[PDB]
Enzyme design. Sequence first.
Site, short mmCIF file in Angstrom:
data_model
loop_
_atom_site.label_atom_id
_atom_site.label_comp_id
_atom_site.label_asym_id
_atom_site.label_seq_id
_atom_site.Cartn_x
_atom_site.Cartn_y
_atom_site.Cartn_z
N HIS A 77 -19.48 -20.35 56.78
CA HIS A 77 -18.62 -20.64 57.92
C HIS A 77 -18.87 -19.69 59.09
O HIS A 77 -18.56 -20.07 60.22
CB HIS A 77 -17.16 -20.54 57.45
N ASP B 250 -18.94 -21.77 50.27
CA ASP B 250 -18.92 -21.02 51.50
C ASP B 250 -19.66 -19.69 51.33
O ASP B 250 -19.04 -18.63 51.31
CB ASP B 250 -17.48 -20.82 51.89
N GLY C 94 -11.25 -13.36 61.00
CA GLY C 94 -12.12 -12.27 61.37
C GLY C 94 -12.50 -11.35 60.21
O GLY C 94 -13.33 -10.45 60.32
N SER D 203 -13.11 -13.08 57.30
CA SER D 203 -13.95 -13.76 56.38
C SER D 203 -15.45 -13.52 56.58
O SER D 203 -15.93 -13.03 57.61
CB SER D 203 -13.49 -15.19 56.45
N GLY D 204 -16.17 -13.87 55.53
CA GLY D 204 -17.51 -13.36 55.40
C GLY D 204 -17.45 -12.01 54.66
O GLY D 204 -18.43 -11.64 54.02
#
Length: 223
Positions: A40, A84, A175, A177-178
Amino acid sequence: IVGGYTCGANTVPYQVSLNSGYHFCGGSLINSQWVVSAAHCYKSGIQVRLGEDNINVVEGNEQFISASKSIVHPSYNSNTLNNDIMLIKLKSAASLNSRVASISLPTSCASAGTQCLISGWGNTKSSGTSYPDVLKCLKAPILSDSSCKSAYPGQITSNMFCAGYLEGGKDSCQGDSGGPVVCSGKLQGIVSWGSGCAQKNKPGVYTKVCNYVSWIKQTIASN
Ligand SMILES: [Ca+2]
């Protein structure tokens, strides 16, 4: 991170900031040339920021390396966020040291109740918006599958799990995520999605990394 605490500089040595003229996603260094993040977060023009604490000040220890290749898992679905996960190859290898270190990939999945640390520079507020300068940390437990699926019936695949705080108040947010979910020194999750934040009975949903180890190693061995 809503309800978290300041980590302390360079205490989470694997945490990276993905930057395109501002911070927009987290990631984890898993070896000197590869970052694992969320599918994403993909965009072109990604610069990987290593060794960071204050993302708005150059303080020493930072390494800014451009992304060479971003390899989104081929079955990523943006509507459900199933699979994801994304691999970023660094244009150049990082200098590994005490402040810039890689995190281990898991050999087994983790169980419900395992405590983990989640970190990032995402939003700190459940209502409204406030982005920190320094890296925030949160200790959170993986929840049981049943509690996860009753909180998001129909939306949880085998590639997800819910880590947190069914009480609300403590959660990851936009902000973040990842970024990493580390349990017993193993990258177990990638911050992925949820309903609002720090919302009561709406825990955070995370990519289950143990389901992706063979794919990461095969994709890395061929690129
Ligand atoms: Ca900085």
